[PDB]
Amino acid sequence: GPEEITADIPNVGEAALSKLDESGIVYIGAEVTGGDILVGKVTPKGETQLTPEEKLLRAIFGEKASDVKDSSLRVPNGVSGTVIDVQVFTRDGVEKDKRA
């Protein structure tokens, strides 16, 4: 499957997603420092067999947390500044998000 830019990163907490908009992109004018998430992206991991432990995890914590990885863009250590501009380039035929 394809990689998705999205606001639903299951493992991270609520605060770390406070500066992202509905499309998973940092707001214009936000003050960021090292380690802050700029763009939220998830990489799918796929297995068609569900072990009983995996079934228990899916039942308790939901199926979204499973079969998904984290590959978000983060500010490098020792880098700070203010978000002044964001530009989105989308391939033709692909649905555009709200920010675009």
Added chain:
Amino acid sequence: SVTEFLKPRLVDIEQVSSTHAKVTLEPLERGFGHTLGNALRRILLSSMPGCAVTEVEIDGVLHEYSTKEGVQEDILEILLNLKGLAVRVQGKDEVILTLNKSGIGPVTAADITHDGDVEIVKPQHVICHLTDENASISMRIKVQRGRGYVPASTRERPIGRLLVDACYSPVERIAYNVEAARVEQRTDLDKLVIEMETNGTIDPEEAIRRAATILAEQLEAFVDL
């Protein structure tokens, strides 16, 4: 006697301008003129308290690196202009002023909403310019009291609140001169004239008294030892 020193007093205060003054101390013994003058100059240039703008909020802006439609200046230039605003706060250590303006023309310090405890000493201070008839600007300005230079970097906030470095020192420059004083029956006494240039937000006499109090409180540690 030789162990008794004649002590100075504030004799003359001349107001050349609203931001320029002269203070006269007389009489002084041999060598005490420069000794007092250098210390007073250092204390006045280093330790005077004042009020300064620290935070700004504008409705349509998100950060300092943007522009507002109908305003000829960038947000950064507006903040730099606001850094130079001279305000005398007489009742509190923190206040919030409101500015609302609309129509073509310069927006200055006289357009700030009146407050009982806040005095604007330079109403002609230009803040920005509106170049469109259907253009309005509204802002909230946070002013607080302190001393010295505090950059905003050294000191979460919502998006749209802009920080500005605070320079609380009201004194712009200090000079002093020692002349020969004409006392009743002695010719070995001096007179100290202190020329003070400020921003008009502090009285020269209270500044001199505050400097003397600071010097005395710092010196009282050497008395006991």
Added chain:
Amino acid sequence: GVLKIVKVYLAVKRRIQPGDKMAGRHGNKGVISKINPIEDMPYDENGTPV
């Protein structure tokens, strides 16, 4: 194989500090060694520091 690209721009302000390189127009370059307080700088008869 590329679906989307997102570019983000960060702006920062750099102030002067010891270790920065200053220069003139006559080949006189140097490095700042100290930031001196205003009352320690030399001044003229009018009290204007350098």
